[PDB]
């Protein structure tokens, strides 16, 4: 498809993504919120199994949302934790984000770049709780004239047809 | 083998004084007895008639721990079968939904029609020289399947009463949601599935008789959500009269409000749609039910729904200490596409694995189940004394046993029904015991 | 918690009408009774004499769920011991294979010789002033160990019959593989180990009496595999006569073919080697067995092998719903290195965790075991009526009870042997019941 | 079902001949009976008074499998409560340690004071029109809590004897560590927690009566450590006399040494501190205990400590085949900060998940537990005949039953106490049986 | 030891490996087959435990193959899935490949480069099935004059002595 | 706020870390010991849960060491394995180190660079044993005049409050 970016752009965008993940891991949600762009779209859907004939045709059983947010709803999700009355977040969860297989390419809109990565999110909470979420992820990133990067979109894929955790109180 | 005599069901629960022993939430023998009797003899939710519109359409679901397939027949009827090949017990379907003409076992190749008969057997003359009776080896069929205004229920036992008699008064509350407009209802956009590590009795009891927790558990969500101008305070703050119905293990609860208003969690467009179509709903049902756009309702054992956000929830037990939740979104058929999209967004935002409200509830249930692992922990009495002795029958036209919304009538009724079903051989004995209990409690 | 008396073994299986209740595949009390009796009293495969050629060589294996070590002695005999230190019960060996002069417990330091006696005890005079009898505290030894033409079997119980009498007629079929050429056989290149989530009865029954599934389960493999000129069509298409032997739980099955031909899954070099050495094999055994290069064979409880690809398979039960498979490749000793490499490549390609054929079988077994979790699922009868009433004894010189290859004689015999062993105290009662059953079925 | 009649405890263990059947390490009914009786009636370690200095300070710990919270009261007393809300059984605390004024249930909002009473109930007049008795619904309280020289123990049963009488002679050995200097002791720097897959009886018995294994299991650590040049040979080589105390399930063991010397694993600064402070310790206690800076001790069921490295270990059972270890480091209060840092470094280096010594012990226990899965493996007798018949009472002023350090007196005493507690209804019967056993063994 | 390639070659070869993994994850087996070279060798063996003396000497218990393929056998494995009668892969499995620790070195043969990486393969199938395969991997890659890369060899190491999955229907 | 290193330094330091991990995976402990610098500090601590008020203040329950080593103690740990009498590591375990999210920054001391990464350590031993350790890691690296790198410090973070393995016989 579109031509791959050069070495410098790949390096800078990879460092930006690593910095955002590190902000999420250290419980700094205001800086992470400062990272996002005003038109952020944060999306995740469900996974289904289909018949052989349907797969050959391309038809699938209907699906539904799990996350569908803009910046304001993310602000509300942050404030809910900041109040001190979220019993899912008391005590807070300990998470690690691992990112790999970074592919970056250009886009039709100037100063916007498309990114695809694979992720493993490890979540441990309270005593003797462990959960792994493995999947892929698509992003779009915008560069400003002052050499600063913003995140415009994020679409997440989870490989579990039946999710095996009681809740998802962590931002992917 | 498994005999109820060794167990002491009536010893564990004391309804009259309002005490519960936690051992009922963690006992494996109790779980096997439940699987044999409660899920064997009670009507269970299967699907919605909107999901199988045309002949040959099927849907895969569960009853207890048994996989079941629901298929629409050519003449217009509906049939449910067990997923098991009569030869070596291998499943014949795996897709979530679709259309088919026959089910084929992949292990050996036996083929069954949609009506369940065994049509094809590979190399039959060589394999069966004496002859095989294809009539005897059809698919296992659920004897009783019946639909109430578009919701399909099924029962394993023929001796059990019919769907209308099993429902009884709770039909009057379900009709409030199901009969708002002409054309009935339909499901919108897929099913959400996830797993929680708690006994199946916790969510059932909460959706039967728990409005007390919303004051403290969901304080943060109310504070944050409390955009377009709307009533910041929830409905319960300004409410005047409240009603709870607690009969036959079926529980329901709501508040009286002057105006038709949904809760603060819903989107503005949904509330506007509710307000605009008030005349038709009032004309079809009546003022009391038309003004109800909030509350909770449960149908024994495992059907739950809330009036405001339009969500259906089904709990499938997986062992004594796990459960699996399937969540559907349901809305009026006459609504346009934009309103249905608004409904889907609102329901998926408020309720789900990542909803604002579900997280705390699941956390509490899992913590309780984790605690119930010690000898001393599961031998200490728990209090169920809310609203004890104030039960009465209303005279304003609302059927059933009624009490204040901050009471545990429905929880005690559910536990009494559980103890009666678990400890009786025949349905008639259960009905006699239930009648005796009602006559006792009412006087 | 487990009682033999409350169990009703004869109730679960009905051999005469051909019905099976799936509860036998999932019951824990049945599993413990099996561990006590069936694996306690039956001959079990241990190793091959090629794996322990020189004195002091050992091999680690299993019997039931008990770890066992097989060691070659100084004078040429073979012994088997339980892996347990007599003081505190810690294992004394962990390597897969090797050569040693003594086994040392790492926890405290007790040392045992290869003959099993306790040779060393650290600080004995200070620790044991009264004195210790080293004769009493030797390694636990398997009382009965015996080798048939290079395959080593072992038995825990002295009262059980000898290896030759336990085998009986199935020895005539095993001799077809083991005695093709002068010099015996040997193993080539390591052992493959993996885990499947299914009861141990599924693969045993399939390798005893199942050729029916290969028509449908392995259709894709036949279609794909079917440049050197060879018969694309499988052997079963053009076979004239077929035989199945179903006696004492020992099962076997094959087709009659004009020419010595292996199946389509083997490599060309292997088939060429089989064709070139036909005269010696025919002279040593006879025309009937020499022309058999395809079939299935199973020895009760858990030894399986196929004639074409030269594979040995052993199943170790791990709980009521798991099993562990060990796979060996075996070939004639006189074969050159190139032919042995061809054998190894062919066997590892066709059968294994990544083989073309094993994947579908393991998938089917795991799906059935997953389904068997509901109360209604494991209370429905299953059909075993193939070839019922056509059993007869051949007069052409082939020993044993014989029926058509598309029949379930061997499966019913295996289930009858299972029910007899599980429900009898002495071997003599088992033998009497087996004789009565054979006299009944033959007439 | 768990009942004394169906089980045969006395059959499994034979103290007089010194035999043990491994089935006691893997039986679930035995585990439930243990949870009911042994942990229900025996004093269990809770905390140290240094961890809760000021009023309102709390600490979260376990008794058996039940979570418990220990809180310091305003008047100076100490109280322990069960972590369970009287309404719906939800926990009220989760932090490891801290200071608080009330415990609030997050599910509904009931609030409890530090003394355990129920102070707040949200919307009580509306929810409970008839009235609620707040006196009855207080927190479950441990009836017996008592501290010995700064170590807090608790008991669930009132009929059991007091702490001093329960300890008895082992108090004389614990006083050696606890009363070395004025001011008592205090804990230094946090708690280490980890999980091992073995029965609790393995570490309990080893820390009761096992010095034999240190010769072989820890050979590599001795060879490597010799941190710099020191006395290369461990204490056991130079030691002249050795003592083991094996009474009432309480075990202890040490060596006699001319000079006050710690083991080779400790740092030089710790040994220098011991040598410098030997005078005060000798003056306070006596020469015999003052010169003891090595050995092992155990208090029934699950308290362990070693004299040299100053470590406290508590084992919490988690099922029949798991255990969780909490490790504390304890030292004299008068020691300066540098010496305490040296103590922490030494203890964490030698003992812990990553210590030089703990790794091999945990490995051995896990291997034994893995082996104990076969029918034949857990039905073979194990030897307990070390030092049999040489028991005698010393006349040099050391209390209790005494034998050589390379003997299993304490292990047999622990198993006898286990069999007596598991098979008796009242404490008086247990005491009578223990007295009879002691009178027998002395003859 | 082995000379390390410069930045540009490292970047290009890493991108090639990521592209191949992405092709495998999206169920595009014909393009993945187009990626391989004619002399591809696809190998995996078993794992054993040996005595201390054997390890000191270097001897091991004998091992055996698990995979041993050329391009034609891989074509057969693809066609078997394409028929529609493979019940192991009906419904298909959902996989993710995560690649890390990429080391690239030159080789004696011109235009051939040696690669070593570590991999985690996550496989989820049907409902509530999850499996992780972690290990190392050795590759050889050939560059054409038109700046296109082909895979010449692949040798895979799995750290499980007793494999804990019922079958391996996924291409590593 | 310290400036990120350029492309060349990032490449070289990443390759050095990969080489060290590969040395650990192949059971070459003498070369790995040769890698470390004389003033190596090898550290790990415990993890605790605190009250909401404590987290707002910044206080937490007290913690304790798990590893605290210099080069000599690491030499002793190596020699203990080399003796042949360590029953924890007989037979040896099989481990894989996966490193990701590498961030490199400059330091005040000349020729010293600070590194932060995320790690997953997979350990499989005997038959049917598997363990994952996921966390973060901080390092300092010193460059010699001959373009050789040494490791000066290492501080490891483990996300488990109650460690779920019976022992830790592997060097992180
Ligand atoms: O009326 C509503 O929409 C929700 C009220 C509620 C509160 C607690 C449990 C179920 C429903
Ligand atoms: O004869 C052969 O080579 C194997 C044929 C076969 C097919 C299915 C089960 C057992 C044996
Ligand atoms: O004296 C010591 O410090 C340790 C001796 C020891 C040996 C074996 C078990 C516990 C304690
Ligand atoms: S398994 Fe269904 S036909 Fe045999
Ligand atoms: S554990 Fe074997 S000698 Fe003690
Ligand atoms: S759960 Fe504690 S007050 Fe209800
Ligand atoms: Fe709620
Ligand atoms: Fe087969
Ligand atoms: Fe020790």
Separation of alpha carbons D216 and D227, rounded Å: 21
Closest-CA residue of D relative to C62 is D374
- Could you tell me if B274 and B323 lie in one domain? yes
Q: Ligand 7 centre and the CA of C139: distance in Å?
A: 63
Tokens 């970074």, residue located: A102
Q: Is D85 annotated as a binding residue?
A: yes
Domain at D277, CATH number: 3.90.380.10
| Angstrom distance (rounded) from CA E81 to CA E94 | 14
Residue B212 is assigned to a structural domain of this protein: yes
Count the neighbouring beta carbons within 10 Å of the beta carbon of residue B13: 17
State how far the Cα of C119 lies from the Cα of C320, in Å rounded to an integer.
Answer: 40
For D145, list phi and psi in degrees, rounded to 5.
-135, 130
| Sequence-ordered strand ranges (E) for C55-143 | 57-63, 66-72, 78-82, 97-99, 102-104, 111-113, 118-120
Return the active site residues of C.
108, 210, 213, 218, 361
CA C252 – CA D352 distance, rounded (Å): 58
CATH code of B121's domain: 2.102.10.10
**Please, which experimental method was used?**
cryo-EM
Strand pairing category for B250-255 and B296-299:
antiparallel
Q: Are D140 and D244 in a shared domain?
A: no
The answer to whether B211 and B406 have CB atoms below 8 angstroms apart is yes
State which of B112, B146, B180 marks the end of a domain: B146
Name every residue in E having a CB less than 8 A away from some CB of C: 46, 48-51, 53-54, 61-68, 73, 76, 79-80, 83-88, 161-169
> Which residues contact residue B234 at a Cβ distance below 8 angstroms, ignoring those fewer than 6 apart?
B214, B222, B226, B263, B264
**Which are the contacts of B244, defined by CB distance < 8 A and separation ≥ 6?**
B209, B211, B251, B252, B253, B402, B403, B404, B405, B407, B409, B410
Going by their DSSP bridges, the two strands B144-148 and E112-124 should be labelled as: unpaired
Q: Are residues B108 and B140 in the same domain?
A: yes
B-chain CB neighbours of C385 within 8 Å are 128, 130, 132
Residue B375 annotated as catalytic:
no
Question: D141 with D178, same domain?
Answer: no
Work out the burial of residue D397: count CB atoms within 10 Å of its CB; fewer than 13 is exposed, 13-18 middle, 19 or more buried.
exposed
Q: Is the distance from CB of C411 to CB of C250 less than 8 angstroms?
A: no
Same domain? For B142 and B175 the reply is no
Closest CA to F103 of A134, A21, C140: A21
Q: What is the CA radius of gyration of chain A?
A: 18
Closest CA to B86 of B63, B68, B54, B112: B112
Select from E38, E72, E68 the least CA-distant residue to C350: E68
Torsion of CA E47, E50, E52, E54, to 10 degrees: -100
Q: Hey, whose CA ends up nearest to atom 7 of ligand 3? A: D211
Give the span between the Cα atoms of A168 and B10, in whole angstroms.
Answer: 39
D34 within a domain of the structure (yes/no): no
Structure tokens at B326: 């399937």
Ligand 9 center to D234 CA (angstroms): 13
Phi and psi angles of residue A95, each rounded to the nearest 5 degrees, phi first:
-125, 155
Q: Does residue A107 form part of some domain? A: yes
Last residue of a domain, one of C83, C114, C146: C146
Answer yes or no: is D399 within a domain.
yes
**Going along F3-129, which residue ranges are E strands?**
36-45, 65-69, 94-106, 112-124
Q: Is the residue at D36 inside a domain? A: no
> Residue C387: its chain B contacts at CB < 8 A?
127-129
Measured distance CA(D421)–CA(D417) in Å, rounded: 6
Q: What is the CATH number of the domain that holds F103?
A: 3.10.450.50
Q: How far is D264 from chain B (nearest CA, A)?
A: 42
Structure tokens at B396: 């304003």
Q: Do the chains contact at D371 and C35, CB–CB below 8 Å?
A: no
Residues of chain C with Cβ-Cβ distance to D404 below 8 Å are 126
Quote the tokens at residue D67. 């979570």
Question: Which are the contacts of A80, defined by CB distance < 8 A and separation ≥ 6?
Answer: A86, B220, B221, B224, B356
Task: Give domain status of residue E45, yes or no.
Answer: yes
Give a yes or no: residue D136 inside a domain: yes
Determine how many CB atoms are found less than 10 A away from the CB of residue B323. 24
Q: Could you say which residues from 82 to 111 on chain D have a Cβ atom under 8 Å away from some Cβ of chain A?
A: 94-95, 106
| Residue (of C284, C286, C313, C316) closest to C297 by Cα position | C313
Assign residue D366 a region (left: φ > 0; alpha: ψ between -120 and 50; beta: otherwise): alpha
Residue D109 backbone class (left: φ over 0; alpha: ψ -120 to 50; beta: rest): left
Q: Determine, yes or no, domain membership for B186.
A: yes
Closest-lying ligand to the alpha carbon of D304? Answer: 3
Residues C251 and C338 in one domain: yes
User: How crowded is the C-beta side of C222, counted as CA atoms within 13 Å?
Assistant: 14
- Would A143 be classed as within a structural domain? yes
Determine the structural domain holding residue E48 and report its residue range. 7-158
Q: Do D40 and B375 lie within an 8 Å CB cutoff?
A: yes
Judge contact between B45 and B152, C-beta under 8 A: yes
Q: Flag whether F166 is in a domain.
A: no
**B87 in Cβ contact with B81 (< 8 Å):** no
- Residues C352 and D52: their CA atoms lie apart, in Å, by 61
Nearest to B298 by CA among B45, B62, B48, B60: B45
**Resolution of the coordinates, Å:** 3.1
Round the CA-based radius of gyration of chain F to a whole number and report it.
Answer: 18
- Please tell me the total count of domains within chain F: 1
The answer as to whether F97 is a domain residue is yes
One domain, residues C369 and C265: yes
Q: How far is the CA of D87 from the CAs of B213, B214, D134, in angstroms?
A: 12, 16, 12
Domain that holds residue D244: 169-442
Residue C106 sits in the same domain as residue C190: no
3-state secondary structure of F96: strand
Chain breaks of chain B after residues with C–N above 2.5 Å: 226
Q: How many domains are contained in chain D?
A: 2
For residue C218, say whether it is annotated as part of any ligand binding site. Answer: yes
Tell whether C79 and C222 lie within a shared domain. Answer: no
Asked if F touches B (at least 3 Cβ pairs < 8 angstroms), the answer reads no
Q: Report the SS3 class of residue B325.
A: strand
Q: Chain A contacts of F10, Cβ < 8 Å?
A: 11
Q: How far apart are CA C315 and CA C323, in angstroms?
A: 6
Among A18, A42, A33, A129, smallest CA distance to A81 is for A33
- Non-local CB neighbours of C375 within 8 Å, separated by 6+ positions: B32, B35, B36, B39, B40, B64, B65, B66
Q: Known catalytic residue: D316?
A: no
Annotated active-site residue in D210, D261, D321, D332: D210
Asked if residue D365 and residue D253 are part of one domain, the reply reads yes
Residue F33 lies in a domain: yes
Whole-angstrom distance, CA of residue A23 vs CA of residue C234: 63
DSSP track, C197-264: SS-THHHHHHHHH--SGGGTTTHHHHHHH-------S-HHHH-S-EEEEEETTEEEEEE--SS----T
* Residues D424, D318 share a domain: yes
Chains A and C touch (3+ CB pairs under 8 A): no
Pull the structure tokens for residue F13.
């330091």
CA of D297 to the centre of ligand 3 (A): 9
* CA pair distance D385, C114, nearest whole angstrom: 25
Specify whether B260 is located in the same domain as B395: yes
Tell me if C40 is assigned to some domain. Answer: no
Within a domain: E143: yes
Look at residue A170 and tell me if it is in a domain.
no
Which candidate from C66, C128, C129 shows the least CB-CB separation from D376? C66
Pocket of ligand 3 (CB under 6 A): D 207, 210-211, 214, 263, 294-296, 306, 308-309
CB atoms E103 and F11 under 8 Å: no
| Position C160 in a domain | no
């Amino acid at each position: 498809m579109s031509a791959q970016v050069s070495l410098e752009l790949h390096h800078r965008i990879s460092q930006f993504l690593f910095h955002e993940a590190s902000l999420l891991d250290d419980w700094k949600f205001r800086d992470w919120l400062a990272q996002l762009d005003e038109e952020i779209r944060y999306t995740m859907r469900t996974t289904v199994n289909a018949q052989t004939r349907d797969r050959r045709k391309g038809v699938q059983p209907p699906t539904t949302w799990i996350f569908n947010d803009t910046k304001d709803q993310l602000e509300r999700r942050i404030a809910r934790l900041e109040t001190g009355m979220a019993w899912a977040e008391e005590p807070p969860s300990r998470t690690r984000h691992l990112i790999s297989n970074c592919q970056i390419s250009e886009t039709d809109i100037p100063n916007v770049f498309a990114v695809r990565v694979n992720y493993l999110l490890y979540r441990a909470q309270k005593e003797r709780d462990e959960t792994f979420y493995v999947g892929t992820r698509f992003d779009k990133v915008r560069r400003l004239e002052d050499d600063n990067w913003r995140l415009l979109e994020r679409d997440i894929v989870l490989d579990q047809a039946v999710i095996t955790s009681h809740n998802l109180s962590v931002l992917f | 083998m498994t005999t109820p005599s060794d167990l002491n069901i009536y010893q564990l629960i004391d309804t009259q004084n309002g005490r519960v022993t936690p051992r009922i939430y963690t006992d494996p023998d109790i779980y096997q007895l439940e699987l044999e009797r409660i899920f064997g003899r009670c009507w269970l939710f299967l699907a919605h008639e909107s999901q199988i519109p045309k002949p040959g359409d099927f849907f895969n679901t569960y009853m207890g721990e048994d996989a079941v397939v629901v298929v629409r027949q050519k003449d217009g009827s509906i049939k449910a079968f067990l997923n098991q090949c009569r030869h070596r017990a291998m499943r014949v379907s795996y897709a979530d939904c679709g259309n088919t003409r026959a089910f084929t076992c992949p292990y050996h190749g036996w083929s069954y029609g949609i009506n369940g008969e065994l049509i094809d057997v590979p190399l039959e003359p060589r394999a069966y020289p004496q002859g095989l009776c294809k009539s005897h080896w059809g698919l296992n069929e659920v004897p009783c399947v019946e639909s109430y205004k578009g919701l399909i229920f099924g029962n394993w036992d023929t001796s059990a009463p019919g769907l209308r008699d099993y429902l009884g008064d709770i039909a009057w509350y379900l009709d409030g949601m199901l009969d708002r407009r002409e054309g009935g209802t339909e499901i919108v956009g897929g099913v959400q599935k996830w797993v929680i590590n708690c006994n199946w009795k916790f969510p059932a009891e909460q959706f039967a008789s728990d409005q007390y927790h919303a004051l403290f558990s969901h304080a943060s969500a109310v504070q944050v959500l409390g955009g377009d101008g709307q009533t910041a305070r929830p409905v319960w703050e300004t409410a005047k009269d409240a009603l709870q119905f607690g009969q036959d293990g079926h529980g329901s609860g709501f508040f009286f409000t002057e105006k038709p208003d949904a809760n603060v969690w819903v989107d503005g467009a949904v509330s506007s749609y509710y307000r605009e179509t008030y005349a038709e709903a009032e004309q079809r049902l009546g003022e009391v039910r038309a003004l109800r756009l909030a509350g909770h309702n449960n149908i024994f054992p495992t059907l739950s729904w809330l009036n405001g956000t339009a969500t259906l929830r089904v709990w499938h037990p997986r062992g004594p200490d796990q459960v699996e939740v399937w969540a559907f979104c349901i809305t009026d058929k006459a609504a346009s596409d934009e309103v249905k999209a608004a409904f889907e967004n609102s329901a998926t935002r408020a309720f789900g694995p990542a909803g604002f409200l579900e997280q705390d509830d699941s956390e509490n249930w899992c913590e309780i189940q984790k605690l119930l692992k010690g000898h001393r922990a599961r031998n200490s009495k728990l209090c169920l004394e809310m609203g004890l002795g104030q039960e009465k029958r209303r005279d304003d036209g609302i059927p059933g046993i009624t009490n204040y919304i901050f009471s545990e009538t429905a929880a005690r009724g559910m536990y009494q029904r559980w103890a009666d079903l678990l400890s009786s051989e025949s349905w008639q004995e259960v009905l006699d015991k239930t009648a005796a209990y009602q006559q006792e409690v009412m006087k």
